[PDB]
């Protein structure tokens, strides 16, 4: 048995999930003289891979009941009775053998929307559970603890009156919830006395639950390759941060820039201001509840091109503990009819379930597309990607880290619907670097390079007044190209 | 047999796939008393012509085990659900002859994305492989290897915790990596005293392997 310690420290979603299944099944006296009975069948959403099947085993051991487990997609067969009579056995065998708890999972492909199929074998099977769930009228004895991710694939016919009108969300184990899942995975394996569990849970912040058992198991393989009573040393977990690879972020495999807060930025006042508003709601939630002000979600960048508006976007990718999902501008816009409105929804939905997370939407000129005076520029009303992003924005953002980084060169092409104070509240502009800030641009490039002894340096920044921050990269490349050209001429 | 000498280059990647197949098979007691054994699956993605089918030939001849091979879409047939059972029959033959090594090929159509696909056979083989993978928990097992392209066409239910969690990319050799390739392919041939293999891979810069 798995007991109660299989999910520990996550009592913010573990003590309230016992109010829905255990406390109705403990005694039927609290539902008398109260009127209606809410918890008939509950629906659980959230990040997949946290223990959605372990909690189905946890309710069977702590509460004495008859548990009938269903793996899910194993019933799919072309036999009239193998996929129709076995689901009737899951509702009738538990009724006579009280209590009647039942569990099903992976209902992503099972019961899709009605536009996909019509009158097939798969549509005939999923209509039987609509009346079998409504057929069980036992008072506080049957409950559906069905655990299914990806909520846009479930058809809304199952949430009409009382089948799945109880919505529960499994939160991220952030406040001391990630410490106990590492506690139960080291009591059975060998560990050396040189690691700290609080430091291990504080370096990385992007967790999906299933990766938590994967980062600790990767350190066990590191001890094998060096050694050719064992334990896991300190540097085996230090190798694990270079390949974190959570289950949700399996599409962003781009190269991360090496930034140590000194190779980017000539200004420090505007750099610190965006650091302060992005590090407050991710670290501790007690400051925003005391002040009462709503947190700003997303920031807009505008100004001259080549000033450092996407170079700073690589600086927010590794040093900030929130995750980084990048898009290459208008690449998230498909050719077909409904595929264009889905690709801008699948990226935002796959990130918000596990979201210490910033996102970098590049090239907002291609997204806002100057909707004022459209005249059918996209053909048959295919320019509906501007208001579909308005549906994803300001949708379930109560303590949800969604920081859209918009780097744009022309601010006048963006429609003012996103510029409204209910969506974006911080408007920052990166100005021209002066003579006191151009010295930090050249010091960022002359940091990790072999260089000559000190020539004149302040006279270089005083003569380039009138050009942007990317123009000094041209003068540092021509000085570096002329150091390689004469080196081959020095040879022989 | 091809061995390991026929796979030239990519030495940073060869240590990853050897420690997950040979080391559970050579020393099964080494994985004891240190917890559960990590490596249960690997996805070999990237460009197609990088040497990704000979890696299955390399693990089928160097170590002494049974090699049952699964091609691409070949399990489809006109019956009352044979595709969900013939794929299941490939895993129950591996359970009978444990330990062994299985190899499934061309994961571009057998396991597509569930939302993009359409049909009733293609959407049930993507469901059948999800149940028999995590349910199979045998020690010293045949743990699956797959060689295909387009890693973005893989469903995220195949990469969660224990089905494919140690995926690797076969990198394209740009510096001193194609030199090891030409030392192997011309080892069988008798070259004259005119070629210079230090200058062959130096003047070209773009190839796949």
């Amino acid at each position: 048995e798995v007991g109660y310690d299989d999910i520990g420290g996550c009592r913010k979603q573990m003590a309230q999930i016992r109010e829905m299944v255990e406390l109705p099944l403990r005694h039927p006296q609290l539902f008398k003289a109260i009127g209606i009975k809410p918890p008939r069948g509950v629906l659980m959403y959230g990040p997949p891979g946290t223990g959605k099947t372990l909690m189905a085993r946890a309710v069977a051991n702590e509460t004495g009941a008859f548990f009938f487990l269903i793996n899910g997609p194993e019933v799919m067969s072309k036999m009239a009775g193998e996929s129709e009579s076995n689901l009737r056995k899951a509702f009738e065998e538990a009724e006579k053998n009280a209590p009647a708890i039942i569990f099903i999972d992976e209902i992503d492909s099972i019961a899709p929307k009605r536009d996909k199929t019509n009158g097939e074998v798969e549509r005939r099977v999923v209509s039987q559970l609509l009346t079998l769930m409504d057929g069980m009228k036992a008072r506080s004895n049957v409950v559906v603890i069905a655990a299914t991710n990806r909520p846009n694939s479930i058809d809304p016919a199952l949430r009409r009156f009382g089948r799945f009108d109880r919505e529960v969300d499994i939160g991220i184990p952030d406040a001391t919830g990630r410490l106990e899942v590492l506690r139960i995975h080291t009591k059975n394996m060998k560990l050396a006395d040189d690691v700290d569990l609080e430091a291990l849970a504080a370096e990385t912040h992007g967790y999906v639950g299933a990766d938590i058992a994967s980062l600790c198991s990767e350190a066990a393989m590191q001890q094998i390759r060096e050694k050719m009573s064992l334990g896991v040393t300190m540097d085996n977990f230090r190798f694990a941060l270079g390949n974190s690879n959570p289950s949700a972020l399996r599409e962003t495999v781009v190269e991360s820039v090496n930034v140590t807060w000194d190779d980017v930025g000539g200004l420090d006042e505007i750099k610190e201001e965006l650091k302060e508003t992005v590090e407050y709601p991710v670290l501790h939630p007690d400051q925003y509840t005391k002040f009462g002000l709503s947190p700003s979600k997303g920031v807009l960048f505008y100004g001259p091109p080549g000033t450092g508006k996407t170079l700073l976007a690589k600086a927010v990718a590794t040093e900030v503990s929130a995750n980084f999902i990048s898009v290459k501008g208008p690449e998230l816009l498909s050719m077909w009819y409904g595929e264009s409105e889905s690709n801008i929804r699948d990226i935002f939905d796959k990130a918000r379930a596990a979201a210490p997370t910033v996102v970098f939407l590049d090239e907002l000129d291609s997204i806002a597309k100057a909707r004022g005076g459209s005249l059918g520029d996209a053909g048959g009303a295919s320019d509906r990607v501007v208001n579909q992003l308005l549906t994803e924005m300001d949708g379930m953002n109560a303590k949800k880290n969604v920081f859209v980084i918009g780097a744009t060169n022309r601010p006048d092409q963006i429609d003012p619907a996103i510029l409204r104070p209910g969506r974006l509240d911080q408007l920052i502009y990166v100005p021209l670097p002066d003579e006191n800030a151009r010295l930090s641009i050249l010091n960022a490039q002359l940091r990790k390079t072999p260089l000559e002894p000190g020539l004149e340096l302040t006279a270089i920044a005083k003569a380039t007044q009138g050009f942007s921050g990317a123009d000094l990269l041209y003068i540092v490349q021509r000085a570096a190209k002329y150091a390689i050209k004469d080196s081959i001429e020095a040879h022989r | 047999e091809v061995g390991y000498d026929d796979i030239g280059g990519c030495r940073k990647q060869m240590a990853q796939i050897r420690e997950m197949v040979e080391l559970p098979l050579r020393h099964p007691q080494l994985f004891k008393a240190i917890g559960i054994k990590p490596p249960r699956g690997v996805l070999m993605y990237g460009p197609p012509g990088t040497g990704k089918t000979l890696m299955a030939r390399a693990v089928a001849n160097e170590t002494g085990a049974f090699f049952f091979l699964i091609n691409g879409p070949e399990v489809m047939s006109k019956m009352a659900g044979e595709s969900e059972s013939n794929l299941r029959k490939a895993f129950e033959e591996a359970e009978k002859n444990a330990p062994a090594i299985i190899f499934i090929d061309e994961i571009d159509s057998i396991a597509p994305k569930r939302d993009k696909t359409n049909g009733e056979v293609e959407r049930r083989v993507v469901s059948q492989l999800l149940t028999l993978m995590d349910g199979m928990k045998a020690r010293s097992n045949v743990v699956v290897i797959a060689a295909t392209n387009r890693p973005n066409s893989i469903d995220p239910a195949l990469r969660r915790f224990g089905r494919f969690d140690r995926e690797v990319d076969i990198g394209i050799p740009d510096a001193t990596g194609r030199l090891e390739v030409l030392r192997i392919h011309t080892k069988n041939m008798k070259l004259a005293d005119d070629v210079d293999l230090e200058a062959l891979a130096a003047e070209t810069h773009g190839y796949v392997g």
């Binding site: 050719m335 077909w336 009819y337 005249l375 520029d377 053909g379 295919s382 | 006109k78 019956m79």
Partner: peptide, 24 residues
């Protein structure tokens, strides 16, 4: 003044074709 230079076809989901698996 402004003339539209494109119709911009963005739709069309084609045909389908089924695979009838025999029963016995």
């Amino acid at each position: 003044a402004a003339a539209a230079a494109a119709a911009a076809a963005a739709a069309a989901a084609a045909a389908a074709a089924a695979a009838a698996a025999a029963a016995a």
